[PDB]
Amino acid sequence: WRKLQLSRAKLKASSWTSALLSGFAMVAMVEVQMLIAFAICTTLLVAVHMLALMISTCILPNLHWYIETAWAFSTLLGLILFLLEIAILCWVKFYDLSPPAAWSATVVLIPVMIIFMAFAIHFYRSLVSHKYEVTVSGIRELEMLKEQME
Amino acid sequence: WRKLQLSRAKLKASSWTSALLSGFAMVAMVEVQMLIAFAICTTLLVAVHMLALMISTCILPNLHWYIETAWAFSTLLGLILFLLEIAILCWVKFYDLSPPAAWSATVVLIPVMIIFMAFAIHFYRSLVSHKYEVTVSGIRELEMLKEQME
Amino acid sequence: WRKLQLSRAKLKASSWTSALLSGFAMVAMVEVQMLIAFAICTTLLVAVHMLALMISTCILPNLHWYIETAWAFSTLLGLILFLLEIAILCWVKFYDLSPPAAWSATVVLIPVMIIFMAFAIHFYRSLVSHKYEVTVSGIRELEMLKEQME
Amino acid sequence: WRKLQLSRAKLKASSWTSALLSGFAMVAMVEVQMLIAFAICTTLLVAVHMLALMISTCILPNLHWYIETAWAFSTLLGLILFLLEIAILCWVKFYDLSPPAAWSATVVLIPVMIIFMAFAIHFYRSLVSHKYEVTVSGIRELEMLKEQME
Amino acid sequence: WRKLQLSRAKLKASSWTSALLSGFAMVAMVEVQMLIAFAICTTLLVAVHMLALMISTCILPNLHWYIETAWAFSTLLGLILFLLEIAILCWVKFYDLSPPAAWSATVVLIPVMIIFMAFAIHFYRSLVSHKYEVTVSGIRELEMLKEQME
Amino acid sequence: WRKLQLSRAKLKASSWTSALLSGFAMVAMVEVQMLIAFAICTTLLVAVHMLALMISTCILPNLHWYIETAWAFSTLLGLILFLLEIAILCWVKFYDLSPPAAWSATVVLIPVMIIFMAFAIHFYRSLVSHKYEVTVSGIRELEMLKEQME
After folding, report:
1. Which residues on chain E place their C-beta less than 8 Å from a C-beta of chain F?
2. In angstroms, rounded to a whole number, what is the distance separating the alpha carbons of residues B2 and A24?
3. Nearest-by-Cβ selection for D26 from E17, E28, E94
4. Among residues F124, B82, D108, B117, which one has the least CA distance to residue A43?
């Protein structure tokens, strides 16, 4: 039951962020209307989220952990892309009369972006260690039973 | 019960994406205001989602798997259309002064679009094989009982 | 319990689409600002959805199937109206400099619109037959008991 | 338990429509920027919904049926006001160059508006009769027991 | 369990109204772009809602009734501020060419605003009396047992 | 079970505020289009919320309290940033013709901002004391059993 709720809640959240972020991001582009980055970033941002949405459709009928990786990976990319997207918007929006201020946007971006990616690595690292920790603990317990068995 | 939750959660998600995507997409068109593609893509995008929404209405009262195909198919089309829609927006929005950058939008589109459709095929293929796998496994188990039966 | 969830989920979805579609549709009209069709379509679209919303208010306290028809009918109309609405937007938005491309919008509309209404008829027809099928099966079973009864 | 779910679901729906409708309606006014009607209708529309939202706050802690009337009444008013609001928008939006088309908006409004209010009266009337029907049926059953009692 | 659902449902509703109202209100200000009131009202409106959102974060981990007062109070303020906000928008939006119509907005505001605040007082008053009523009823019942006790 | 619902509800709320606030805030910037503050505040606001969204993805699979701190901290920052963001918008929006009124926005900001941060400290302080209170009460009860034990 614990696993059932995990997927159910995640499904709603996935479409929640993907749909809204893609919509607002799309509107952001039409409203404003370096150049290549803005176009590519926007297209990729939408595409990545769309992939996640599809995952919501396939997961319902349903190796399971494999797709889980695709969803988390895709969802994560969208978040990074959205962050990159807003950074470009600040640079592009002010790019006309505000170029001086535009720089502060990307400059401040690096600090949070690095921590964003770095934080994920630290968490993943701890998770990896735990898997190994259980691996050693599991075999040991089994060995104890094996020794007393004889 | 497992099946009940699958439909319940899916129903909310369907209207979730269909309603939001259609709304934002519609707003994207009015804000900006090759030419034929933009008009057709927008109209089709909305129509496809509307079909899915109706499916949410008919599924409640309720062969069942058949309609399931219509919903997944329609929902999937909307996602592809939305991706195509944003690609057109980038080309159209910049189409005025930014035509040069506009190309990068569609060019980058192909890469993700191919993977989007290709990924679905791979998943479906594995699903098809599993169905056949169970088919062979099922008859075999039944035969074992039939042999011992005699 | 199966019936309880059906209404509960449907209630959220109804307000979901009706509220969002009406809001975005309304915004679509103010942003842009044949002529008569656009005004009437927009007004009707909003009115139909509003009716559905009210249905959500009356259903809670609660012949039951009768109102169900009103909700499904009203909700269905809104979907058709929204589709018609976007079609008009494409024609009206481009109606200024883009009239040539504007035609493709309504032309492509017919194909999907016909399938949209036609698909509903097919589903309803099957439902009607089932009702009659059960009618014959029900009386037959009762007759069997009546015969053996004597 | 049946009563618990009724309030829980209604609470989410109330804020759902009230919040969204008020937000979009508010945006509709700023975008466009007979005259008095538009200003009053918009203000009243928002105020009515706000009242409903507050009701959601007071109902949680919690005569109960009395407040229920306030919520339904307020929510209903908002729906009627929103319908009136969009009708004004069509008239006002086109009011500049499109006056000829603007008339069709309010004209078509009356038809649906009358049915909207009239339909509610019919449903309420049937509900009132049912209350009386049970009243007569209840006393009759009690009398039967009283007669046999002696 | 009854108390658990009360908080769970309220949490979703709080963020629901606070997030949407703040977002739309913020957009309303940028779109339009007496003067001091508009600036202060908008800032306060957002701030009050933000406070409520934070309350949603603190309540999860969790004297309990005390915070409940803060949430209801903050949420209530936002509703009043939003109502005041729209009133200012009508006056400001028309304030340029539409001054004649702008007045009707604030004038009609007073009527509903007074009833909005007055209605709350009446409800609170009844609640206060009930607390005292139980106080007298509780001691009396206890005294009856004390008398017979001797 | 009590803990399960706490995370489930919080997950939906997190994405709820983060997604909406980021979207509306992003749109607020494009619509309007001291200078440096606006650019940095907007970028940081989005980045902080994105971090929270990712947390929603990692929490599902899942030391637990540690991440809880990151989510609450990140979510809290976004709220403060959003408040700061709107304050800047009022100053920037009016910054053109309305500079005189622009000051009232930031001035009024301080009052609520201080109370916003101060209120959190008071609540946290009480929580800290409670932890210590239980610490003393816990050891005391255990000691009583230890004494009677001998």
Report:
1. 4, 8, 11-12, 15-16, 18-20, 22-24, 26-27, 29-31, 33, 35-36, 38-40, 42-44, 46-48, 50-51, 53-54, 56-58, 60-61, 63, 67, 70
2. 34
3. E28
4. B82
Got the DSSP string for E64-105?
HHHHHHHHHHHHHHHHHHHHHHHHHHHHHHHTTT-HHHHHHH
**Amino acid identity, residue A40?**
I
Contacts 24+ apart (CB under 8 A), C112-121: C112/B43, C112/B44, C112/B47, C112/B48, C112/B51, C112/C83, C113/B47, C113/C80, C113/C83, C113/C84, C116/B47, C116/B50, C116/B51, C116/B54, C116/C79, C116/C80, C116/C83, C117/C80, C119/B51, C120/B54, C120/C76
Q: Is A29's CB within 8 Å of B123's CB? A: no
Q: Cβ contact (<8 Å) for D13 and C15?
A: yes
CATH numeric code, D2-149: 1.20.140.140
The residues spanned by each domain of chain C are 2-149
Q: How far apart are CA F19 and CA A17, in angstroms?
A: 6
Structure-block tokens of residue C27? 């915004």
Q: Find the distance separating the first CA and the last CA of chain E, reported in whole Å.
A: 40
Q: Do D24 and C26 touch (CB under 8 A)?
A: yes
Contact D28 C24 (CB under 8 A): no
> What is d(CA D106, CA C74) in angstroms, rounded to the nearest whole number?
20
Q: What single-letter amino acid sits at A89? A: L
* A101 contacts: CB under 8 Å, gap ≥ 6: A94, F35, F36, F38, F39
Task: Identify which of C27, C39, C51 has the shortest CB distance to residue D101.
Answer: C39
Scan for tokens 């479906």, then name that residue.
Answer: B124
Q: Which pair of tokens denotes residue C105? A: 């919008």
- Contact predicate D50/D71, CB 8 Å: no
- Evaluate whether E21 touches D53 at the Cβ level (below 8 Å): no
DSSP state of E109: H
Q: Give the count of beta carbons closer than 10 Å to the beta carbon of residue C83.
A: 23
Q: What is the 3-state secondary structure (H, E, C) of D40-72?
A: HHHHHHHHHHHHHHHHHHHHCCCCHHHHHHHHH
Contact A27 B24 (CB under 8 A): yes
